[PDB]
Design a protein around this motif. Structure first.
Motif, short mmCIF file in Angstrom:
data_model
loop_
_atom_site.label_atom_id
_atom_site.label_comp_id
_atom_site.label_asym_id
_atom_site.label_seq_id
_atom_site.Cartn_x
_atom_site.Cartn_y
_atom_site.Cartn_z
N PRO A 149 0.76 -1.43 -0.07
CA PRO A 149 0.04 -0.10 -0.02
C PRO A 149 0.83 1.29 0.03
CG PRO A 149 -0.11 -0.99 2.19
CD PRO A 149 0.26 -2.08 1.20
N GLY A 150 1.87 1.58 0.70
CA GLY A 150 2.44 2.81 0.88
C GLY A 150 2.45 2.99 2.30
N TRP A 151 3.59 3.97 2.91
CA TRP A 151 3.44 4.48 3.89
C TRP A 151 2.14 4.90 4.84
CZ3 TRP A 151 7.21 3.04 6.97
CH2 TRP A 151 8.53 2.52 6.01
N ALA A 152 1.58 5.62 4.23
CA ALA A 152 0.25 6.35 4.78
C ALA A 152 -0.66 5.05 5.24
CB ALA A 152 -0.52 7.07 3.64
N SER A 193 6.67 5.64 -0.57
CA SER A 193 5.62 6.81 -0.29
C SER A 193 4.22 6.30 -0.97
CB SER A 193 6.06 7.87 -1.26
OG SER A 193 6.50 7.65 -2.72
N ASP A 194 4.20 6.02 -2.13
CA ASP A 194 2.85 5.52 -3.02
C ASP A 194 2.51 4.08 -3.09
OD1 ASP A 194 5.02 5.62 -4.83
OD2 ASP A 194 3.92 6.52 -6.36
N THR A 195 3.60 3.07 -2.90
CA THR A 195 3.59 1.83 -3.22
C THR A 195 4.33 0.94 -2.15
OG1 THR A 195 3.88 0.12 -4.95
CG2 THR A 195 5.69 1.40 -4.63
N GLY A 196 4.91 -0.28 -2.49
CA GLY A 196 5.50 -1.00 -1.54
C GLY A 196 5.77 -2.73 -2.25
N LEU A 197 6.36 -3.30 -1.28
CA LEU A 197 6.61 -4.69 -1.70
C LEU A 197 6.42 -5.58 -0.47
CD1 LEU A 197 9.92 -4.84 -3.63
CD2 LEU A 197 7.60 -5.12 -4.60
#
Ligand code: HEM
Lengths: 101, 442, 54, 59, 422, 49
Positions: B258-261, B313-317
């Motif tokens: 999802p990303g940090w947020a 920031s806007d994504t992830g693994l």
């Protein structure tokens, strides 16, 4: 009184595995617990149990038994595996119960 | 008692400077301390022609400033017993200093002089060139790395995130005093920087030092503009680097995060805690609580394995990485995927309850020292827009229940097409198809 | 063995000859007749039995 | 968007996917049959007994 | 509400020590420090210490191999053993509310082990592994051998069970080693994040292997030999040292400084150490990549001190030589009143930062409460460190150039020099 | 070195929706699977018949 003793000693002689020189524990079916238990036996007790068995097999193939003199006697039968076996089962019952938890 | 120790933790002071820069700190009784600047710059920000600048820079940040050349700069730092270190990732660079709370202000000056006035001596650049080139040849022998880069390389293929933080070989061999200069001027800017301090320091006396050495005020509005980055697209695929001459094989598998947020990152972590990690020297061995670790031991599936929730920031693994012998890759992957599927379908409250306690001790473990506390502050602001206290976290963690974990994992894991990276004697592990089908049915 | 596919004395057979069985990446259509032949066989035997019953 | 609704609703959870295949086969049959018979019969107007039947039916 | 507590440090009749310090951290970190290690091993039971370290998770009279792991894990806790050739530490971490729980096992593992033959035998082949991961770092190969060539006993004993003894250690060797060394007067129950009253209540009404000094470590003689290992590595590691100062010996604060004067472990990422004479001097002598530092060890009844050099096999000669002259040139008033000034801080600094880590703090509080029974205030150690004359340092440097050296090198030693060539 | 390695261009083969290297493939995700799965499910019904 000594009823249980009389009975046990009887059934013991009734079964007659001593005629082969086997100890009670030598006759246990090798399920999973028994298996772990045997693995914990001290080198000697294990080798002694090993020969005892191979001896009894060679007897069964020959269709014979030991001479009365050599039969294991009800009170001289050493329950070498039971102490271990009970632990193996204890440990397991613990693990078992703990995982449902 | 836990419940309270969480509150008596000194709050983190945050005050922004009229130039865009943010100052933050957690004051403690500690005589010693750590402070540095956490820049929101990385390889993600690099283009295809300047790939590696932020790294070539990371290398020149300590070879002197204009106000004081190499020898002097180094000498000045050593002689006060301060430790100057830092790094650079895909979406985050940072240079911090470990010193006695006393030198706190003379330190801030240093930090400042590094970011703003890096010398970039034409002669130092030709040296750092052969140096980086080696680090590339040394790091090329660290399978774990060659693997995560490869993971990204395909996971985010065709985008920025698909880039190594060290950069290409050509970029190292050709980057100019220019681009380096440029990179710094383009990225190392106040609105995108955070001065974090942890230890025995007064927010005041700190915030002031910044005002003094962190001047350069912005005129236009564009200077106060934190540029939004072009989205990186995830792609279910695979890259297989085969070399049967390698001793053991490496396998890393992951789905998009999802990303940090996103609050789910919490749940995700609880999940990862349930699957945990393992290596041949874990003493719990066959009794470890992690099912995957257990089987790993029972069947000697891998030398080591780990779950990870790398955020951006806007994504992830979100995935896992295991190292194993050439002939057990298959069973290993099989049991692992299985566990993932177990997550989306049958997680127990028993598992989560434990996973939570591990995570709690995990988060607290990340604030064991000034450097780690400073790192957390430097990154929290930059990424979360502020700082999240252990008391807050703990709430978000006690909120998770089995039912929650399943829904969240199903949401990000179930039936997704993953990204796969295999390196070494990988013949036994095979077919993306087969691996893809491992993404469903417990 | 972890998965009951390779350990079971029978599922290990179905598996080790029709599922985890290693096959060339390029075998063409002229490689389909083996299975057709098989299938074909199972079908004759079935239709035949049905007929032999009358 | 039907494909997404269909995916999440039917095709995602392997159990409902099968459930769809069953109910789906049911409906498909009923209609595939009707239409095909309809096609076949129409293709043979007045040739079937179903047709000429009226000429000899009536007690 | 909570504030600032004070570091208590009781001591029972049996000589057991308790060192508590509440710091209201959200997590506690208890540990059992003991005077044990390879130093008490004999040719007869070598490696038995090593194994005992790994044997921590085996069943105890109170907790099963199973419950020890699942139990400590159930509460997101941890458990580990760290040890030198003369000290052993069994510590566990956990959230505050789970101290008492994580304690049962700590208590059990250190006082009530069962060392069951099978459990033991099943474990033994592990020494084969734990040791192989370790030896991956040549850094640890030359050090085992160093201690060997520098000694004749106690400390000359390897930290990792020698190969031949793998699988030959007995459950008895273990017990006896535990009965003989893990005794109340050799043990300390330190602990951060806890109220002294409780850690005390526990220690007393809970610990059993009692009173005594049991086995006495044999006085550490000094050999002064050189062990060399030709292995082909493109990198030669070398460690040339001489008797250093003992733990406690006022003569230690001297080397610690002579250490920081010669340079000991970079402070600038990828940087050159100018405040490092040794490094700086060696740099002028060699051309290709390398590293050289000040080696300092402080043991109960002895210590080691000298330099250590990682260099390319070809430029090993020039590197170790340069490393030497640079130690002699400092043994001859080659130390500025300022070098002593800069080092004095780096040491005070390093010391202070070492205690930010919950592990570091607990280790400080511990070591003292064990090899003393007191906590030397932080300002006392400062007054002790700077109260070191420009001479004391230059003298320490002499004791090196004068004493009998014992070297240890492992790599393609082809171009490396022999102790009798320095 | 591995730093010099890059995943080739799959434009020639990518589906419509996941062709733009700057658009979350996760949106057209349920769409791309729902389709292929529809085909399959259909084949099953055809077979079931
Ligand atoms: C290897 C598989 C088989 C082959 C090649 C085969 C072939 C044939 C052939 C050539 C005929 C003559 C069909 C005709 O033109 O009228 C036939 C007839 C027949 N087969 Fe088979 N058959 C097979 C298996 C079986 C089996 C296993 C049974 C049942 C146990 C069976 C039962 C019959 C019967 C009852 C007839 C007589 C009815 C007829 O003439 O169609 N067949 N089969």
């Amino acid at each position: 009184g000594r009823l249980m003793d009389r009975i046990r000693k009887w059934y013991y002689n009734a079964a007659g595995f001593n005629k082969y020189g086997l100890m009670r524990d030598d006759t246990l079916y090798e399920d999973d617990d028994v298996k772990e238990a045997l693995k914990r036996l001290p080198e000697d007790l294990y080798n002694e149990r090993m020969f005892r068995i191979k001896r009894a097999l060679d007897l069964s193939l020959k269709h014979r038994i030991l001479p009365k003199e050599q039969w294991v006697k009800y009170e001289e039968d050493k329950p070498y595996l039971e102490p271990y076996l009970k632990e193996v089962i204890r440990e397991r019952l613990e693990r078992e119960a703990w995982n449902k938890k | 008692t836990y419940a309270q120790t969480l509150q008596n933790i000194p709050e983190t002071n945050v005050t922004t400077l009229d130039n865009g820069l943010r100052v933050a700190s957690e004051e403690s009784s500690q005589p010693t301390c750590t402070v540095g600047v956490w820049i929101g710059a990385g390889s993600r920000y690099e283009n295809e022609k300047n790939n590696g600048a932020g790294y070539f820079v990371e290398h020149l940040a300590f070879k002197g400033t204009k106000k004081r050349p190499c020898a002097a700069f180094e000498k000045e730092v050593e002689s006060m017993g301060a430790h100057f270190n830092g790094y650079t990732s895909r979406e985050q660079t940072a240079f911090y200093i470990k010193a006695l709370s006393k030198d706190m202000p003379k330190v801030v000056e240093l930090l400042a002089d590094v970011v703003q006035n890096c010398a970039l001596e034409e002669s130092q650049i030709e040296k750092e060139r052969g140096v980086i080139l080696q680090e590339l040849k040394e790091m090329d022998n660290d399978m774990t790395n060659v693997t995560f880069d490869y993971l990204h390389a395909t996971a985010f293929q065709g985008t920025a995130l698909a880039r190594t933080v060290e950069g290409t070989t050509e970029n190292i061999k050709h980057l100019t005093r220019a681009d380096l200069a440029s990179y710094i001027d383009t990225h190392f800017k106040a609105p995108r920087m955070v001065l974090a301090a942890a230890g025995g320091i007064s927010h005041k006396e700190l915030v002031d030092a910044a005002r003094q050495h962190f001047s350069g005020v912005s005129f236009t509005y564009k200077e106060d503009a934190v540029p939004i980055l072009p989205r990186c697209r995830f792609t279910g695929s695979e890259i297989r680097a085969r070399d049967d001459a390698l001793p053991v094989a490496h396998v890393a598998l992951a789905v998009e995060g999802p990303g940090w947020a996103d609050p789910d990152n919490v749940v995700l972590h609880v999940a990862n805690a349930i699957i945990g990690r393992y290596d041949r020297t874990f003493g719990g061995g066959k009794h470890l609580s992690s099912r995957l670790a257990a089987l790993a031991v029972e069947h000697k599936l891998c030398h080591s394995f780990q779950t990870f929730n790398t955020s951006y920031s806007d994504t992830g693994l979100f995935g896992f990485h295991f190292v194993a012998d050439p002939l057990s890759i298959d069973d290993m992957m099989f049991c692992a995927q299985g566990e993932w599927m177990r997550l989306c379908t049958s997680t127990t409250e028993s598992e989560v309850k434990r996973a939570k306690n591990h995570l709690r001790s995990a988060m607290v473990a990340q604030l064991d020292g000034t450097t780690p506390v400073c790192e957390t502050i430097g990154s929290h602001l930059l990424n979360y827009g502020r700082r999240i206290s252990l008391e807050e976290w703990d709430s978000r963690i006690s909120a998770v229940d089995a039912r929650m974990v399943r829904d969240v994992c199903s949401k990000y894991i179930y039936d997704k097409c993953p990204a796969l990276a295999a390196v070494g004697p990988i013949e036994q592990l095979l077919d993306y198809n087969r691996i893809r089908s491992g993404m469903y049915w417990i | 063995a972890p998965n009951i596919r390779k350990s079971h004395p029978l599922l290990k057979m179905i598996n080790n000859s029709l599922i985890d069985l290693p096959a060339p990446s390029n075998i063409s259509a002229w490689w389909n007749f083996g299975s057709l032949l098989a299938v074909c066989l199972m079908t004759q035997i079935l239709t035949g039995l049905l007929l032999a019953m009358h | 968007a039907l494909l997404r609704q269909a995916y999440s609703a039917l095709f995602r959870r392997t159990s409902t996917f099968a459930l769809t295949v069953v109910l789906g086969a049911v409906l498909f049959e009923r209609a595939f049959d009707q239409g095909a018979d309809a096609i076949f019969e129409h293709l043979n107007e007045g040739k079937l007994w179903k047709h000429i039947k009226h000429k000899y039916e009536a007690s | 509400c909570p504030g600032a507590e004070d570091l208590e440090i009781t001591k029972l009749p049996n000589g057991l020590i308790i060192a508590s310090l509440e710091n209201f951290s959200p997590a506690s970190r208890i540990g059992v420090f003991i005077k044990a290690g390879s130093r008490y091993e004999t040719t007869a039971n070598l490696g038995t210490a090593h194994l005992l370290r790994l044997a921590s998770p085996l069943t105890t009279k109170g907790a099963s191999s199973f419950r020890i792991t699942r139990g400590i894990e159930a509460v997101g806790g941890s458990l580990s053993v760290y040890s030198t050739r003369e000290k052993m530490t069994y510590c566990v971490e956990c959230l505050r509310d789970h101290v008492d729980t994580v304690m049962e096992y700590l208590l059990n593992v250190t006082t009530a082990p069962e060392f069951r033959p099978w459990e033991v035998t099943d474990l033994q082949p592990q020494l084969k592994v734990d040791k192989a991961v370790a030896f991956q770092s040549p850094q640890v190969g030359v050090l085992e051998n160093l201690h060997a060539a520098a000694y004749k006993t106690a400390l000359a004993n390897p930290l990792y069970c020698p190969d031949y003894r793998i699988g030959k250690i007995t459950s008895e060797q273990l017990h006896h080693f535990v009965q003989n060394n893990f005794t109340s007067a050799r043990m300390a129950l330190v602990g951060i994040g806890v109220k002294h009253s409780d850690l005390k209540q526990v220690a007393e009404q809970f610990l059993n292997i009692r009173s005594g000094a049991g086995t006495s470590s044999a006085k550490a003689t000094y050999w002064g030999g050189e062990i060399r290992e030709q292995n082909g590595h493109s990198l030669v590691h070398a460690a040339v040292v001489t008797e250093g100062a003992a733990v406690g010996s006022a003569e230690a604060n001297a080397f610690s400084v002579l250490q920081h004067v010669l340079g000991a472990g970079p402070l600038i990422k990828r940087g050159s150490s100018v405040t490092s004479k040794l490094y700086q001097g060696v740099a002028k002598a060699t051309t290709q990549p390398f590293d050289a530092s000040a080696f300092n060890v402080n043991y109960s009844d002895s210590g080691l001190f000298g330099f250590y050099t990682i260099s390319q096999a070809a430029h090993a000669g020039e590197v170790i030589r340069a490393a030497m002259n640079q130690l002699k040139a400092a043994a001859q008033g080659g130390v500025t009143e300022e070098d002593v000034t800069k080092a004095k801080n780096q040491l005070k600094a390093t010391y202070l930062m070492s205690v930010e880590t919950a592990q570091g703090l607990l280790n400080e509080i511990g070591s003292e409460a064990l090899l003393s029974g007191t906590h030397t205030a932080p300002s006392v150690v400062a007054q002790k460190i700077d109260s070191v004359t420009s001479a004391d340092v230059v003298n320490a440097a002499k004791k090196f150039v004068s004493g009998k050296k014992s070297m240890a090198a492992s790599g393609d030693l082809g171009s490396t020099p022999f102790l009798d060539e320095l | 070195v591995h730093n010099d390695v890059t995943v080739p261009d799959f434009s020639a083969y990518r589906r419509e929706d996941v062709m733009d290297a700057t658009t979350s493939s996760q949106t057209s995700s349920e769409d791309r699977k729902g389709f292929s799965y529809l085909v399959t499910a259909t084949a099953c019904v055809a077979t079931a018949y």
